[model samples]
Target: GKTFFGQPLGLSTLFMTEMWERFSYYGMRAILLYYMWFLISTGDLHITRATAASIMAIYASMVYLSGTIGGFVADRIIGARPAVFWGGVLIMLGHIVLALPFGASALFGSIILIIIGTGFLKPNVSTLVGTLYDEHDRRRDAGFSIFVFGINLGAFIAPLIVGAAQEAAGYHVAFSLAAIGMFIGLLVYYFGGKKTLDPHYLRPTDPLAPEEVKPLLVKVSLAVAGFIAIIVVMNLVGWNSLPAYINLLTIVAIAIPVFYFALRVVSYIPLFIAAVLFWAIEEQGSVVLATFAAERVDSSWFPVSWFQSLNPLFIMLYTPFFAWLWTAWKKNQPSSPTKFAVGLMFAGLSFLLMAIPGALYGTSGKVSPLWLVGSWALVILGEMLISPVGLSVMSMWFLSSSVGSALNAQLVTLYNAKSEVAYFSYFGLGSVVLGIVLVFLSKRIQG
Candidate 1:
């Protein structure tokens, strides 16, 4: 690690690299769903409700899954540095492709590129930080936490810009702004290359040694290009209608490896299932919830995007209080599994809040944004319990003995492992199936 005036330069380099990388990625994501519904006109591609849902599912799932794949590659070839750099470049080019004045065909190409780029970039950047401190560094977690906060800043700001642009000028302009962000990120990495460790180019991890990795990487590249080419030709020639189904199939196809590994390697069946279901439900914030609002609420009064802000907004407001409360209740706090269950219950309750309003004004009606926002706040509080604590405990469980880990071992402690995971999975599955329970209950009470 290089020294800048006496301090380890690794932190500084990785911090800005991650900061700009997230700036580009999250900037695009903020307005993606809203853009799908409002910006995508019926003139060209002809997107529908099912198509939007499918697209949303693909985009959300791919971003996370891509990161997972990047991590795997980092373990083997490309170490971390080159992989992270290429990831940034891929994202930059993808944003540019999107910004280009191309038809539906170009849109599809850009999405594919961005998905691949995200897969490479999202995971390796974090791994680079691990390289700095090594496996033994006590400062690793703290450094990573600070690095993570850098991401939230971008997440917090990007949507406001993209959403406003989409509302004001047009979708192209919104997308272009995202392109600009990625370009800045790429440029930073390009110039900073000297100061940083070239892990992939230099001491490549090459999980399978030099002879095995070289040919494999080339073959992988050729195969990916060929695969994408075939898909493109299919879109151009045979099935304009078939591409939609391809996205759905692609999602399921991608899931096969992730679930298989989770079940096979991790062997924590419940945690793996919990992750799938948790994010699945968590993803509704942008898709169904926004669509539901546009239909049933007087959106003229509130920026629908503002509803998305409420959860983060509450996290900022109430996190400190929750932190203090957890400390006070350290002895009697719910087990990790129990808290996870409670989180699911709270998340479900959030939906029920909507059902009350949903039924009160059925079909043609409007509900106050306050009802949605308030419920989201409650869910966020439950989230503060299950999410941070859940991740901490789960990672520990995966690592080693839970002897000193009070939270992992004691269900009565602030955070328990099982409860954290269980809460989120239940929350995810609960909303889709059991949401009507609240809707029915609301009507019954009214009667």
Candidate 2:
């Protein structure tokens, strides 16, 4: 009934729910790669580093990619609330699966559960957050900013707790902690959501029309059949190669969103590409850099997972300054394309910064944690430039032309690279070059 910090009460509920969801997600991720590649003597999976990285890329990519279907399902079949509930259940179950030492089977099973669960939960929850405010409410953006802070807050703390648990008690213990986080989120949603969440979110926005129901069911059956066929094929062919899945998913991820957005309108191409490049680097925070921190960085103060917190930490700390800077320079601020280009350059510089320590120390030694810390700081600077402004750019486009989700698709291939250093270098350079090109192109875009 009342507001928290000037936002609707529902926003706080959603904020806390999402925070815990991210906590569960990022916490598991902090140690997931290490768990997969740990030595046999340590009772871990002992999968190859390359294979583990591939899995990591695919898993992370699919989580985002699945959001496409998740949003669709929430709109068409189930309401956002139930979708969130079921998603949280599946996520909790997945983490529970991981908590048990069932070896590779457990890992794969848990992956599937989390992927599907995240698909259901993440997008729908965001939708629910939007439903908390009226369309014309001036407080909506500010409310969203506060909600985002909640997400980062959860992300910032998860790695510390989960990583410490894993180091002290082992992988299963860390995983159990993640499951507990998800459960806590569920409890919060169950108890607090009824009172706080808008009743409107409890039902689907676009349930199937009478004529469409049959077709939808038919398509669902076909999807089930296709899933069965893939299972059979995997059984016969053996799921030994990660590259095939990585390559295929990567292609599908890129193609779907790019083609969807491009087919809708002509002019969003440069913005989407800029977003893709920016996200490709931004996403590596929890994937490649997670691996890098685990293997290469000397982080004795905390577990390698704790290194994952720096991005959010920087976001929280610097967002105010960036907000003010944009406000103060409101009239003379760079054009959207110029900002995107500058953001890309900063992203490139982040990886370039990482490259120095890797070059000097080599991959064999653990360099200071400051190296990763510095890299995140720079990337967050780029993120502040790109992410919010990018959203504003899209908002303008949405008024003029239809817009579609394409950010995840652009990120798929970038995450698939096996060599972290090589991957970072190529994309890092690519972003810089693209940033320069966009700088020249900004005048045309502005015009």
Candidate 3:
């Protein structure tokens, strides 16, 4: 096939597929908060803001959890290429469920589908993109940059369009657009794979041995039954509630890696905690910061959902700047541990910056949008360090990020309209101190 961007035609295929997948996912999420809360009325969906935030946090946490699960399926069962197809299908159906006006049931149903869908699709597609280029190919870096650009481009505008649609038409309508976007992306990926991707990817990269299959199936079935039993007992014991669910999830998120990675855990404690703290604040943009945008920030001129765009907006703008800095710095570039340590401080400071407006004006009235804007800017600087950390195994880094969001599930409960100052400052300063302590330990942690 002919080249698309001085590399391979497959690049364009993946680029468009990922872009629209992002568009649909982010677009649905922008309105998902309001839909769960008090925005849409007359039918259902009249939950407390705190509960809504908890649900969103767990939802995000599961995406990472499932991503790891699906990676295994791709690794040993169906292969990454087919995994891409099925993942897209799951996502599209998940959005389709949301577009239906089933109220609260629709919300949960859509969540279950989307979580598994995203796990299968998100990580696998990135894997497939890696297959398109050789290790030493000069175009490899450029190709990934292009792929990431598509991601940023899609994310940047998704909320805007979805927000406008929700404002004018309705929640279901905005959700419908997400479903449509996903369907289109799915078609592009399915057809494009036939024409462009290698035939080999259609088979698993590491297929399981004959004897391993039966034992693995038994383990999977027992795990599923055990999970269901816990939920049933929780219901029976009357401890079944959203907060309880979040607590369970947070424990499992923390527990899984602790048991699995017990060997390396001793060496990476600071780095592990640092990564978790960094993502804890960073993940807030979609939940806590989003809640602030809706509750405290003036949305008279623009829809509150548009604030979601600021994250990708900052990424796009800062990406080139950071790229230049890394290149020019060369030997001066900070090591991974130092960067992680410093990144934690920036993340902490981003939250700390938000507390000023809260302390000064209080949450009774809307403040300048810059409160959120400045926070995003600072957090993204931290992101450059973390993203380019050039690392992951068992995807503990991503699971730690899941743990980060699980922390948010707890953290969001502490948030009150009246206690904005305490909420922002306490978390902010704690992260800063954590980073400070890790700074001197950075050299040893890297070892």
Candidate 4:
């Protein structure tokens, strides 16, 4: 009964670790888009705002994409604990490098480190949280809630603190803070973890069998070697642009499910497309809306980085409502597909509403901060609809989330201060149409 806060003693350790981890990542991310695009940076890459936006989207996409590889590593390669540690280590180094005064080159390398590290760390932490509770433990919900709350709680606070740091000092100092944040997380994990976590966590849940070891190494080697070969081909073929790399990833993101299992993937097709559409619009908050925040919205009221906090803020605020509703809805609840369809509609409406501000006032001046806030509010509602429904097709959801971000990487290029209305309207209407189509297919999708 001495467990911290009525949960397992170890749960508190994970809570500290995850909160600090999230604080670092989101803290870095809050200012990252602007760092990439803004005219005057410490060491400039000279990339356009659109390309920076594109890179931000692609960076986020890769973060999720690599989680698949990370999942494999935890399940069969290393246990979750080591995987999480190494991952956090790389993440801290990523921020440390970014904290240094470097140009676009360091940014690219740091992005790679963060991407792989996040893949290694994030899901494994979630996995560790699941391991703490028994299959039917009554405290499971509270345990999980504590963990989830730590996540959003860190995220919500990150931007505000970093933005102030950014204003008072500069991005590098703020970036330095993120590195410190992760280091503190690492300290908590290694220190408290020894007293808390189970020793069983030190071994992989499904370790590679003796016979499977060599074959696995061989396959991994081939992939590693093949990556270099692909780079050579990319250079020789003259398809070496950043966008070109994304085009290749876009193919994998979209074609993966179909190519892998066409036989029974049919049932999931309608639902997947609907979810992708929802994410496409919903994911734009970072790149498109982020750009809008800086270029068009007034920052004097609050820092543009502050706008990013709305996602976590609303997620935390609205989560309880959804929980209560699902409990109350009981038999009256909508099917997953139906909820997905409605989520798409709300996502579409969010963007559609955004177009109004551009239409009425044009992008000639910085508009109210609330415009961006309202957009996030609507999109978060959409997220609640689809996010909590839970899908077994989660691997695809990662790709779907990334694929949509990739889609916006291109869509962002279509946007500029001069042509705001056209861009928002086009994406908005397209999503609305797709949502309407999904509504008709909801029956078949749920079947």
Q: Which structure among the candidates has the greatest TM-score?
A: 3
- Residue-wise lDDT of candidate 4 within 199-223, one digit each (tens)? 8878788987889988988988997
Count of clashing pairs, candidate 2: 0
Q: TM-score of the candidate numbered 2? A: 0.87
Compose the digit string of candidate 3's lDDT tens values, residues 278-316.
887888888888888888877987778998999999999
Better of 2 and 3 by lDDT: 3
TM-score of each: 0.74, 0.87, 0.95, 0.94
* Best-first order by lDDT: 3, 4, 2, 1
The C-alpha local distance difference test score for the whole of candidate 1 amounts to 0.58
RMSD in Å for candidate 2, one decimal? 4.2
Q: Tell me the spans in candidate 4 whose CA falls farther than 4 Å from its real position.
A: 39-43, 263-265
Instruction: Give each prediction's root-mean-square deviation over alpha carbons.
Output: 10.4, 4.2, 1.9, 2.0
Q: What is the Å distance of residue 383 in model 2 from its true position?
A: 0.9
Looking at model 1, the pairs that clash are 66-119, 335-411, 336-416, 336-419, 336-420, 337-418, 337-419, 340-419, 340-423
In candidate 2, position 308 carries an lDDT of 77
| TM-score sort, best first | 3, 4, 2, 1
Runs of candidate 2 with Cα error greater than 4 angstroms are 39-46, 221-240, 261-265, 358-364, 392-424
TM-score of model 3 (CA atoms): 0.95
